[PDB]
Amino acid sequence: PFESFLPEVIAPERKVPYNQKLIWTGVSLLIFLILGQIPLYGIVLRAMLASNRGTLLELGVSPIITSSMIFQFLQGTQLLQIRPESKQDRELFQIAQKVCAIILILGQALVVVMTGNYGAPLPICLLLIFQLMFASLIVMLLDELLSKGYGLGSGISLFTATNIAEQIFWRAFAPTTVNSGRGKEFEGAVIAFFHLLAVRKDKKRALVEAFYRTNLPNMFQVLMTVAIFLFVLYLQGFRYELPIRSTKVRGQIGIYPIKLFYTSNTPIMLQSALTSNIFLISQILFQKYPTNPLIRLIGVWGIQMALSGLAYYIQPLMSLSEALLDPIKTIVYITFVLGSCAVFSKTWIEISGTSPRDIAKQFKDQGMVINGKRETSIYRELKKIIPTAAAFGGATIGALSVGSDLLGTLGSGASILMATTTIYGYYEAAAKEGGF
Amino acid sequence: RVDPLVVLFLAVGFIFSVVALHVISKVAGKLF
Amino acid sequence: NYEYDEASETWPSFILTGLLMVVGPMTLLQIYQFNEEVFKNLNEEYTSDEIKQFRRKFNIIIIVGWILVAILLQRINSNDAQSTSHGIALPRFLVDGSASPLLVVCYVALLGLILPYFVSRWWARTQSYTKKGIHNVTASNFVSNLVNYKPSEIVTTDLILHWLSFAHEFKQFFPDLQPTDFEKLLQDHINRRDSGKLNNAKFRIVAKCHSLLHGLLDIACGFRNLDIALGAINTFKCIVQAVPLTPNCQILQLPNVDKEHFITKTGDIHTLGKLFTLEDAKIGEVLGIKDQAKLNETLRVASHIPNLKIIKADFLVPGENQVTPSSTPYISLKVLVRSAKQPLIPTSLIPEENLTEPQDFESQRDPFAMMSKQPLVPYSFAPFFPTKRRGSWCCLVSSQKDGKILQTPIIIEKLSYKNLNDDKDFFDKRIKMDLTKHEKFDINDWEIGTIKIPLGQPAPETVGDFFFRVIVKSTDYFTTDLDITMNMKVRD
Amino acid sequence: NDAHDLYFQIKEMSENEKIHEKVLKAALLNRGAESVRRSLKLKELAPQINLLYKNGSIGEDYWKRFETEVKLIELEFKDTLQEAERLQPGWVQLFVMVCKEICFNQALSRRYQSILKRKEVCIKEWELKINNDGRLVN
Amino acid sequence: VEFVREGTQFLAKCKKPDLKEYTKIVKAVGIGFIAVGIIGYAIKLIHIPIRYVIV
Amino acid sequence: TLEYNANSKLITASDAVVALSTETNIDQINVLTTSLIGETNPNFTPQPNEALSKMIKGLFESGMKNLQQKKLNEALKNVSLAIEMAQRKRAPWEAFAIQLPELHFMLRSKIDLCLILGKHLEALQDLDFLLGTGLIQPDVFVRKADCLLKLRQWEEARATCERGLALAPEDMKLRALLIETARNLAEYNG
């Protein structure tokens, strides 16, 4: 604890209406998108159109995210001993957030300017440091503004959803062309469809030539991603509403919804990280040892993609050809990706403090009970509801990811689901609170 | 402490300053 | 490095797709594209031309897109047509011609001038209005008027007009006129007098007074003041009907009467029921109009405005059968919209089915869903109000220990006027033959509406009887309103 | 709309025309009574204004103006007390209660005086026909 | 085998959205998705020739 | 502006037109000056006077004596004179808790006398002031509803009877007044 005079946005004294909120969200989004397209000054195809490297958004939201996860882990491991009974330790924690983020920004900026390919030879170095510092400070202040109450929600999730939708739309309506021997071809699906339908004048052949397009995006992937988007939107309304009633103040009746997608999409990320790590480890080990009685069994790599090994079994299927090739690998991969997701979802609800015991404790604290049941049975009733919901939600998310990667959509099921969840949160909040 | 309009003005000013520096360097290299 | 289009071979297709993706859905959507109102026709037969003129005075995109698509498609069809070489679709002169600095200067302008100026304009415009719908200066004036208000002074209509004449929204319309001029215009409107030249200003400010009176009522209820709320409602009635508040006003609000004859001749008719006591010709002889085709219109107006009546009123708490300390109850009223012409039906005839409350979880979780299913109120008969209004009933609750309004007023809009139709004309007051034993009378045909008011405050912590007072007033007519007292028996 | 400036006007007139000494004390007691009344009025009006502001029906600048007036009243009363001490020595322990009582007494006197004008508004509004002796003649 | 059984039981006990609600859901979510996607695409597209001329 | 007299020591505003607030304040300053001229001790105490109280009591007793002799005309004059003297010749800094109850005790008798005499509007206004100044009792709403029924105001009469019964539901006169009000109102509408 100490005294700090740092720039911070003050919360509104009254609730902000929906129109001002939406317009501020839009303005902040436009500023964040324009900030990441401008290159630096002193630095010496495009080579910077794909990733945000060489622009004012070099660091981006990485320092904020790293500080957030570090202090979240520090809170989870029970080393801060925070108590919600006071309104000062919370502010101290919020200022610790910022004083750690600032020093991390400084360190990372110095590392990049001293090591990156911008150039070793003083005023230019000072300018390159100041640009990155000012941009990171602007992004942090903008996130704080959107989170304090002037925006529909957080900033990080909004920026991620915006990037996902931007990539989805650039994979389809890209004006860039590519000429490799045969001629000039658009890098988009709809653009090339209309081009080949207009100029080629051979409809029966141009339609088939523009619908499959083994080398580039086509219309089939667009139809598949639209269908998957609609299906994901349908599976967002599933919810289990159990009736509850109050006992402190009589006359308060409501419902407690238990969604299908219970977890926060963290276990799928953990499972993908785990399988990627074990695959790369098997690759490196097979590279180190050519032939061994056990290493030949654990993994074999050849023409890179592993074959006749455990890493070959756990590798993801790219298209339907590999699926119809050998059903054994397909069924093993399906069972693995579903079981691991279910187990990770159960463990995550057991760890993250959303277990049925915590919900029963919250019920006892607020005084609520279940409508047609006793008071000593809320725990025994939530035990028969919450774990099943979490496991089935994890299994459904895994199956959706597998189907999306199999049918070859423009975006993986995980990103589509994250964006859909982020937007459905805003929609549900606006419907519950009441606004245009 | 800081108003939303202040943040918008800061962002637009920084962006315009970087773009002005770029175009000034470009026209200086083109002229001399 | 990119290779921009130099011979106009790729940007035609890009622009064609950009135009089609906008034109298609618009054409598709273009190709794809409960309460009887009796006064809607009789209102336009009495409105003067000076107000008709005021209310009168105060797809091409698809076609141009399709012709542009046709032009571009014809231009495409009229054209002639190992390492990778990336390229873009945009034309070449945009980046390398003589119009190269034009792009960057237009970008700088659109980013530095148009964006911040417009955002600041929108912010300063949305930061000035109140969530109710009135300006900030008007609300400040209203609060400052109610703060230094001497309780000895009696509230009237002239005082509330004097308060309204200081609204800041009246100044934005005509920056030349003074508040005294606005008060004079309001008095000329209410007293049915001619302004000579400022009629188009009188009509404008009179049409604007609606939101101002609603905001004043809201603030007066927020300061826990009953006399000012009642005065505001009476002033709203007076402005809508264009008549000053007098004892005999329910009979002077009628379309075509003469005051100098009715006031001097009779002195005992003051309501509409006392009027309908008389025969069909004696009414015309008393009101002094002596024209049958002209008397039928006023007799059709006088027998079609709604009067209220209670059937059952009590406090209900969702999920319980009595009131307990620190519970959250509400008020459930069963009203009966009747005409000024029909006799009284006893409460015992009600089959006790329409008065009970359903006992189910989906019904007791939100007790207002059944109330939100009633039809809207029809258009009111106001030939002097410029615009067109729907009826409304403003219900506000106060206490009986001290006499202070304890919550903001609830304004209902959905109610069924089925009992006012012309199929039930047999049920007359002048026949005096016990019309309940009639061939056409079936007690299941008369509808019994419902009104529910959230209480906003929990029940007190003590045990005993606590009395309230509920007032349900109209905002368009001078009908019979509700004023009842009720007590919650917090019993534990 | 106050009795603050009228006392200053009487003071400036006394500095030139040699008025009596009790007129100053009368004006001072009147200013003190008005200050006490306004203090109590604000103290009882604060919660309703705060609720109107929280509900979003009053604006953002009127709240600051009200919070400024709250302390402006205290400054004015402190100035009144300083002037009361300056004009008469050892008259601060009794001046406060004297003002506290004259406030209520003059408010009650105004309320009682208002009924004579309150009586005719009701006649005009209800169209009563009252002859002499206050009786009705229909 | 009890996993799938409890799954289908919980699914039977759920509250699936009807057509009138699903229409509003898809309308709002599609509007938001297209609103963010078009803005991203336009900002990404405008800055190619501007970055060519400036830098 | 404002002029200052010499012998009377009264302030009067010699302006052409003056607002109401300035006139009330000048009248209050004149009352305070006239009280201070008479009050001799410089450090005056909020303790009430005595001779004024004896005079008021004497006038009130002389007025009440006429009720026994059954003279209902000059007794009202004497009571009104007593109330006028109490409101006029009493210093403003005297105790409020002793200045209010005497006014109530005299005004109640004036009300009863005016009600028995036949004047209903004056009695109604006295009841309204007595009720708005902080006296709510079942003995007030009865007379107020009686007045409002005597001068033909039925909705206000019904509201008064309802608020009176909302305080003392065991009363036997307010119920009769409520029945009479309901009868008159049912005749008035139908």
PDB file of C-alpha atoms in Angstrom, chain F residues 1 7 11 52 54 84 93 117 156 175:
ATOM      1  CA  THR F   1     -35.422  52.377  -2.340  1.00  0.00           C
ATOM      2  CA  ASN F   7     -40.734  60.272  14.982  1.00  0.00           C
ATOM      3  CA  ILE F  11     -39.467  52.149   7.361  1.00  0.00           C
ATOM      4  CA  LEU F  52     -50.466  40.933  27.782  1.00  0.00           C
ATOM      5  CA  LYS F  54     -53.750  38.836  31.604  1.00  0.00           C
ATOM      6  CA  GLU F  84     -56.515  39.887  16.952  1.00  0.00           C
ATOM      7  CA  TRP F  93     -39.356  36.359  20.054  1.00  0.00           C
ATOM      8  CA  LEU F 117     -74.179  31.112  14.331  1.00  0.00           C
ATOM      9  CA  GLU F 156     -64.164  16.994  -0.654  1.00  0.00           C
ATOM     10  CA  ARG F 175     -69.968   7.067  10.001  1.00  0.00           C
TER      11      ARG F 175
END
